[PDB]
Amino acid sequence: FTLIELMIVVAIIGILAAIAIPQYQNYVARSEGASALATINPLKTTVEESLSRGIAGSKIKIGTTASTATET
Amino acid sequence: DNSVDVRSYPNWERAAGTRITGSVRTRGVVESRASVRTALRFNLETSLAG
C-alpha cells in the first residue's frame, strides 16, 4: 500500500459524499389525501340508495353488523 | 268451534308488513229446548146432608 491510493480513495469518498437530496414530503401529503377521498366517496351511493328506497335517516350507520329491511 | 289470529303493529325481524304473533281459539256448543205449561183451575164444593 502507498499514500497515492489512500489519498485518491479519501478524495473519491468526499466526492461521492456530495449528492443532493430534494424534498419528499408533499408527495406523501398528497397521496394521503388522494386515498382518503377515494375511500370515503363511495358511501354516497349507499346514502342515496337508503334515502330513496324508503327507510329514514339516523338508522344509517357504519360497521359490520349485517343488514335487514329497516336499518342499513 | 272457531279460531282467530293475533297480530300487533309491525314488529319482529325489523319488518314492516304486520306479522302474526299469536292466536286465540274459541269453542262451545248450542242447545235448544221447548216447554209447554198448563194450569187448570177447579172450585171445590163440600156439604154434609142428613
Side-chain angles (χ1 to χ4, degrees):
Chain A
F1 222 69
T2 182
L3 184 65
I4 301 292
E5 189 111 335
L6 189 54
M7 207 55 46
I8 292 282
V9 163
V10 167
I12 296 156
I13 287 282
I15 285 157
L16 288 175
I19 295 156
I21 286 154
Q23 189 167 13
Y24 287 119
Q25 192 172 78
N26 291 354
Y27 297 121
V28 182
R30 204 168 294 141
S31 81
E32 286 180 339
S35 75
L37 187 66
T39 300
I40 62 121
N41 190 64
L43 306 184
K44 284 187 280 90
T45 61
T46 297
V47 164
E48 285 276 29
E49 197 199 12
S50 52
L51 287 175
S52 61
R53 198 167 69 206
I55 65 184
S58 89
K59 295 181 167 78
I60 299 160
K61 303 168 180 177
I62 40 73
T64 313
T65 56
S67 187
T68 175
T70 308
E71 311 180 37
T72 291
Chain B
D1 168 59
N2 194 359
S3 196
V4 185
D5 293 332
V6 186
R7 65 206 315 163
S8 81
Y9 73 112
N11 289 81
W12 183 42
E13 296 269 27
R14 299 279 81 76
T18 317
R19 297 286 183 79
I20 295 159
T21 315
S23 175
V24 181
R25 271 70 176 202
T26 82
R27 302 153 297 287
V29 61
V30 189
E31 190 66 28
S32 63
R33 198 187 300 93
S35 176
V36 169
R37 197 190 171 77
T38 308
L40 306 175
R41 183 162 157 162
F42 280 88
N43 60 281
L44 306 177
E45 284 294 329
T46 44
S47 49
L48 279 166

